[model samples]
Target: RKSNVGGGGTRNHDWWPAQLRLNILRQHTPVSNPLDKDFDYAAAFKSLDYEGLKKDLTKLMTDSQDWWPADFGHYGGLFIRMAWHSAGTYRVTDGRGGGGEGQQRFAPLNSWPDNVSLDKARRLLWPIKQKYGNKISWSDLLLLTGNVALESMGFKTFGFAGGRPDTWEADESVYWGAETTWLGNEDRYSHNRDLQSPLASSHMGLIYVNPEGPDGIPDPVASAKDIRVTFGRMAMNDEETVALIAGGHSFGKTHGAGPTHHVGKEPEAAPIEHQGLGWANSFGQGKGPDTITSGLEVTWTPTPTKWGMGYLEYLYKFDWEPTKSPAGANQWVAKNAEPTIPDAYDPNKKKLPTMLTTDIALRMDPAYDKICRDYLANPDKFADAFARAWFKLLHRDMGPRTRWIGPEVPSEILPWEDYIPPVDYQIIDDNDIAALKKEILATGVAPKKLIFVAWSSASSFRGSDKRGGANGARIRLAPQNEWKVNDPSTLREVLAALESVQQKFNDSSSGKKVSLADLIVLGGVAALEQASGLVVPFTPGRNDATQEHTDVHSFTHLEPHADGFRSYGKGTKRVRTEQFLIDRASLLTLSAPELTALIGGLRVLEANYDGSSYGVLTKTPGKLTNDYFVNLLDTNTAWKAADNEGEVFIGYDRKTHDKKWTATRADLIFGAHAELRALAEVYAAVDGEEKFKRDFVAAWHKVMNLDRFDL
Candidate 1:
């Protein structure tokens, strides 16, 4: 229903490789959805037979299928892997990948090397999915099954949230990595364990690290480094990382019974007769013991189907030595240990317990070693860590706790959820807002800087994960204000100027208090009103978040490498300028029309980063006009690439050969592409100036309120 290649397009025929992709905007058309129209999933879920679905899921856990047998007659560990991989794709860098959508049902994720054989896990849950139907989404079902399976396998879970909505098709918006090869290239790294921006995994096909080791080298010490970098990138600290890996290892056996050469191609590349099931192994029955998914064959604990202290007991009890599975994958064997571990398929046979190089790395790395030993000593402590970490793993991409669906959502707020305080005083109303707007304008911060500061704050809102917005007024805080793209000097100056406005309003009364957060947005609204004579809608209940509440390290990820709405990225050449724009806009939940109008309005209103004239196509830079689209779409003003990357561009007289205006791909895309140009044409039409003004104002107001989940 949805196509992932070439600019988020649908089924199409295109030979040209250089087209600006608008598919992100086009992906969710009626043609893409089976349900056709909005299905009111949230309201429908309210009527869900929630307990019944879990009851059925729990029942299905141990019901081994003849086609693909469950290990230890239990599907707990398999579901754990399925859910972990589903949500674990979330990187804190951009907050893009998570189980928020059951993307595991689609390509890239479904066919990822680390996600091998996980397709079988989903297929096993199909009966539950079919039974419950849309009462629960594939997104919720995948995560819920993991929680249910863990509980069935004698493990306690923290909680669950079920607001995850299934996308109709694959998402191509997330930038996984640029590496063409699967492993060993380390092409995305800048230094030791320093993965390039926005990518959490070490390898392209890997969810995190190579289980055998980094690049398949069996060096436990080196493996520890990658474990830190990769896990840290996904927003797991040392304790959470240790808990997740160890607690998850408490169940599940690695399947590599034979050499991988016997295994067939991945799901996407498999022959048609496989019927979308893949990794068709040709050795033995390829069912009970012939599976080769990680190629690392071993059980981490003796009780692979159940949770216990056995993982730590075994790791600390007997030393491990490097060994290879029959599949020739590097792993570890308990040194001189007896045949104490029961086999997954055999009823009576016992094999020595084994560990992956990553498991041993926990014992080797000093920080992880400390956390593991702490957990090993206090079993209850271990369970708590594992439970909370596991929950966060699943729901970290979910924005506010209020957005969380279901009764099992935890009562205590986790700071990673980006908590913002509710309004503590009387909020400013229309009259007060008018006075405040006049006061803010009197501070003498010009309209450009005001809108720039406001845009800087609100643009942090990534609708993908629903974190960071103007609601928190976090733009004035440490990491956000420190970000160079915000033009920090102007940002600081403007914040101080606006702070004076905030002070004047706050000192006036006890019942009324307006946050710098609201005032910041109010200032932008006021500025836009003055500039455009169109009053941008302003909501004044936003509360300022403190420096203490902000996670400096985590917030650093929200700092933009490029925000194309402002023509911000000049040197961020890793991705094309237009690609970053689409990704950024898509994250902001902006439609193509909203995206086009905002960019056109911002350019004419002179919102470029550093106040650069990169896309200023208007004679009157301070006016909210259709001049950007009108002038750009003018046939006399032709554009040419300014550099080899084709990101920066220059407009010139078509016949005079004279440079007229400077632009970025963000600017020319409106004229250079079919869809965007069509959108631009509407704004640039003879009677369209008023429409563009109204549209831009409405769009600006919408962007400013994106994080007003409370409102």
Candidate 2:
């Protein structure tokens, strides 16, 4: 009989810890090959110095701030965003290189037009090498910066195991270059627009705006929003596209002339000019009045940042709705700018974007956003769902052996003051309409409040749909899972159940329809127990409405007025304001701080879209970029943005035997920490202490795992 090496235990009855078993094996068999390196636990432990380690980490974070800080001159989230966008560009047909190879070292990669200033990322890591000596590699160090941000920011734990060997030379070709093919032609041409060959100007011209010159025909210049939307539609995965573009938010917030005001034919413009650079100075240089010779003047347009405008444009103009596209041809068309040829295109390519977009775009099914809110509101129901999604992403790497570790919570007993009512106070109802009428009749409200209520009213105000669409179209309402608790007894029961879920990762009862209160309790408990230090307050009475018509856009903006109170005035329709008025006065004061805080909170949740991260790496090596280059750098500004905010871990498995390479929760955590440490070290290398501390903390809390899986 063959030796049963795969059995549950060895021939002997002895059982050993995984680390110990490896250690003993190493000691007993000393005659090993030269390439077999020993595990460096000592180095791992040495890298973490508890004594002044936080300070060191803080310093490291601060020192590197200049590489991508919003204040000094960098796009905060660009690096990580670049990584995401670059990785998203990969395709499986290209083979070998995918994201695993980081082979973006070749020509087209290097010359990618949108990938500006990638050399800075390489230069940024130089001091890290100097500080850590030869122990750490740039590949390992740069990747981990994202990890630190995630953990520090109060996100789920991301583990990273280091042993990446540096290449002797830098490929320098992996960065992205300029856009070529026109907007609608992505399907015919590649989504990357980096190819050297010139196709029919018609093919390229589909997305093309006229080329502008002095005394020449006015050329059309696509706004960043248009470019973003074009790429997003072609990319397939809507969330990834959104996330990648959103990464620009951090960068735009930090760098550029300021908000690249989407000024289309004057009357319609972005609601605000990013305050830093008033309207005239921001965006493309010649783009100002000087560039606008007689024919080619820049026009003000609607803000691209608003929900799915890019996709909406594609849907309306190209008649491409991703869900309706056969074989996902429509999605691919956005990237390649080509028509679907059926057989050649593989109608069932089942690309990541196809799946994600299809799921998200479905009006009938629960949106992922709804699912997330439901999870937060009801952990028990959502856990199985969460596990399913998590497994989909990780199953191929880990298989059945990966154990599901329960949720982690904060250690200390925090006070009630620490909890922040999850919903913004202004958004929630407070029955002030009944009793507070006396005051409303007497004093009246302020301008900000009046304007805010007006905006809110506009969002909820529904005109007769002569178009005959969904009647519940505009009224803002709470999400699905949870209900209002008018009685004290019901509230306590829900609260207790929530507490139970929090203390234990699993709910005490294994039934369906767990209360929303239980979920909140669980989230609160998880944060307190697992995170090093961070606290949030919990408030009750957020009621849920079953209808889908609730204002889904509520999370995006934070208005000046509170919700559910007697309206300052309920009579008139509200008008949309221009950028000048919005930015200088209302818009900035109204949304910027809230936007910043919302970002902070989301970073806390690791609320990233998953498909794009994995989608870009599906291509083969050299096909997208070149392979075998020692130095691989991604110049996408979004990558820089991600680097600023949190850990950008791009785990890839290049080699295979029994498919042993896998990513675990612990691996994610450690990887995030390592990246932070490396990032901190790099920062400390050039800058001083104060800067290091600020950056370090920013990155740290962004991905911190405590309370991540709350209710």
Candidate 3:
């Protein structure tokens, strides 16, 4: 099993870094409000600490007033999201494997019309750089900002590495010297037998085998220009293409924008410029006056449309509204104040990477659809390319010192250990682990359920009580709805009851009535439920706060837009729900391979029962197929059965074709293979079983190293 030790080194020498030096100078340089707070680069950098940084981020995120005057501050949270999308432009090319360097934020490359707003956001990092006084580069600064945003906003850490450098003007000339292309330039820009398009389309359709359409078998043959315009180029390299598309998925899901459709508004206007694509009202209001066109041929059946809507609904139910709120009142309206940033920008003239559309014959046409099918067919080949694409996009705009880590790192890095408990922290001494195991065995609970909890006012979840004096072990659901397995209110009451338990435990003569193991198991179970958006099992160890302050606002809950939602509300929740399902699958992965056989059987039950309500097959409409729905129902049933018991297992092999993991024959829906593999690896590590570890790592590498799916 991987090392369980924690405690890693983090350096934040604010005054020593080059970026901080630049920040210092910029503070004194004349901008708009030069004298306001007297920009102190050295001081800001010197003040850097994990706690302080967390607080600063929380303030930046939560304070509308502070953000009301600067573009970075106004759209600060999403700027980081955009940067990730821009970085996602890279994929493993030929044999080379590397991520991006933040090139998309600069000129020539930044001139592309599709990248217009992103370029502007890049400028906001200058102040941060100046504050760092040349201690860091724009590339590092941007990437770091992205990491900070994800964590501060209550998302995963993204496991990013730093130390990238900027490029000299000479190096920048290479790509910039090439002529810029457009979305319709597929024929001339073909690469690797696929055509390239300089631009990306605004909408992505669901995969439908026999879509309701006039004269339909499939839509008419796509013209070179039409294909280029609609899906970019057909010959662009897989890395360049997949990175952009996956980046779009990550970006859309992170922001809850849904794969945008080009109907009432241009796709460009739907991002940071507007709140939740302005379609929340439309969907919530139900199908509007526009007649449902039965004859319209859809390229893919399980389009991200329902996923996006369901995600939004999840957020709404939890009160995580992303719509802008009215000024003075809590309602959503575009905040065009000076500090607010524009969402769309032009990258048409920029020397950006080419995105290709392949002419491979297939029943599905959406970029994601093609990619998924290709990935599942040959995961290793696809993952290798996909990882490269992920890194390439990361390095694109950053100056070139990013060449340090090779994409093909040893299998050690392939394990999920890089994340989770993390590479640092000494929580696991052999003795501590042994003692913990003994406690668990004595209690008859699995050691896997024990987790250490620290107190925090992070943005995603506000502690049960707000007073500053609260203390003791506490557990609460992350996604919240995961507590559905139990009574939510009762679970909440139990969690609130922890303070008393802790006090009683302290008073007990043996100090063993309620062991830490119990707390850990209780917390982990509760967290599992929360992560699933269901009822969780929370136990209260913390006391109510003595002094209340909403200081942790940045990471917890965003103020609802005037229309009533926050930026991350829509996308985050849906992804979390998906994550919850994947988490269940991951647990099964830890069991033996024979578990695969059980899937088909369990899936039958799930298909017959769970799929009718909570399953994606039931929730996802307009694109259901017989085979795919059956498969998904089966998978859901297997998981539901697992959730019912304390354990379950899921198996995947190329030849078996588990009915639970395929799209319906009528509609070309694809399984979420990557998420499944990723979750599996996470579980392997958590279970701390050697065989599970090996298999999990192998599966992760296989999944991440596959070729881009071609539909």
Candidate 4:
């Protein structure tokens, strides 16, 4: 009998064993973290000498050095720029990039054009972090330093939170763009610069839109087009976008004192002589006035170290016209504004105030212009919006407030985070769980659908930022409930049935109840126990979330594009369907074994999208048997390609050549890959049924509890 199938099987090109191993399927491994496996970052942070550290940071703000001298005699603007770039990478579309892991120190991010002089900012904070040791993580310190920078200058922040653990390795997980050149606008946009999906930045190597305007055209109104869409992808609206731009520009000045040719390569690509310290420049000592980051030198206000509405006032007070920086980068200088801006290095020199084309966009766009006018009239409104939006920008990817540590965590719960309410009544125990399972089965909804609904709810969990999971019972809400992959009709029927059982059972008890979130998961447990005759593990205490708490617009991103558990793909074929399976698996924080077990179990249960029998290899669709593996390994059936892209295939009886079964890449992948087939053989063996059942149950139980950070 043959060991593997049609395509994607081990080939003659694969002499190396590691080459055959699916590296994408096995990320977030224990070895990824260099720190001790059991090290508690939260515990270490809680025991920190908070006041002493703050005192040290306060002193360091103005602590000048010869190598990277403080601008305007304070490190406030420099520190603020670093933190802004760190947090700015966090796009809400997929919840991947953020300062949450201190990823700014790693490659791609550290080497990005927007993050250009931030290396100095990290190096500047080194001595403070060294003294604190494990008690202060670089992730938290990086963002906290920004908060302290604002305070060091004359501004108040909303609050701060700690508990961001550091990642030793660089995150290559984020899909920045497909561009070959760093700042090239190749293939990213459609007509009129509508950015492609899942990529927040307008160009490659940029955190958001290009600073010199779209493709350096220097058109303010045209610049506004990219800003709204770019910032919207970051989950910021019109007002918050303006608030961040205006308030942030109030302090710092862009660098571009000289051309980029004067500087060395970026940190990762730098010459060995200047290893750790990159951007080594030969332009007039390259320390104070010669520093270049954005390649556009422009101070927005007279005083660049303190916070005020001078930026908004300047926007309305004078008309701005397109101009070029000394480095030949496009920018704008106020036409009639006399030289009133003080030079950072020389207090004696006064310069004409200038702005980026992006800054002019705020005064040009109707919605943005209105926000700017309001900020100009009432300065407090601008400050409050800036602080709240700043806090959101920093912590959007940090996940739930429960994961937050330290005293400065705000009291106000933000609407962006998934809101799972507290368990108010006497919680369901083992006996109660047993009773609920029986009640759920009495609804007459089939076991396949119950499992499908459960998988749909929990599989949405993105461990990248810990956004979704079954804990919130968000499957009943918009975006999720309406998603095509979820089979809207089936989800409605399953959720309706489960809610019925929940109501009747809760109606019977006083001060005792279980949430629909728990019940959704329990429905699957009951179905699995019946199908396998194995006692599936279960837990309770998930809370039902409200509509108000959910961001319907942002939640749409979490919907499955190609989820293999259900053998589903939502729209046009971009990458192979199997690749999206691995994508989802990686984001789920699932190892290879767990990912294999869940998909196989779901296949035999008739859980494919719209009940297409593509992956249901077993004759008995309702049972959790190893029949899928057993028949998949059968040599009696010969496989052949069906779909145009070879994504779908059909199997025929070897002798008669009569069609036997249909399968997708999601299913054939198990039989096509040698290592995956090795796992498949384990389940296909006569002695392997019980282990498969147990493994499947464990993986199922694990997914249900993925968002239970408190547990």
lDDT of 3 by residue, 1-711 (tens): 123544434444433332111111111123432233554332333333434434454454434332112322334434554565444332211101112344554443344434323443554455555555443555555665655554553343324444454433211212111233332232323312332222232111111111111112222123222333332211234334543343233222112121223123222334565532222222221122121112121111112211111111111122211121111111121122121112212212221111112221111345434554554455445435544444434543222121223222223222211111111212233343334334333443222122112111111121111111112111252322122322244434434444344455445435233433234334333332322223332322222221111223211221211100000111131123222221222222212232212222122222221122122232222111222224342333332122422122232333563434222211111123432333333322424333432332343222211211110
- Work out the TM-score per prediction: 0.92, 0.27, 0.28, 0.95
Scored by CA lDDT, what does every candidate get? 0.84, 0.26, 0.29, 0.84
Model 1: ten consecutive residues of lowest lDDT: 10-19
| TM-score comparison, 3 vs 4, better candidate | 4
TM-score of 2: 0.27
Candidate achieving higher TM-score, 1 or 3:
1
Model 2 stretches astray by more than 4 angstroms: 1-60, 64-69, 72-76, 98-108, 169-711
Candidate 1 at residue 404, lDDT? Answer: 81
Best by TM-score: 4
Counting clashing residue pairs in each candidate, in order, gives 2, 139, 163, 0
**Residue 474 deviation, candidate 2, in Å?**
51
Q: Give one digit per residue, the lDDT tens place, for model 2 in 406-487.
A: 1121222112111222332232123322222222222232222212222222222111101101111111223211212112
Candidate 4: misplaced stretches above 4 Å?
1-21, 570-573
- CA shift of 535, model 3, Å: 73
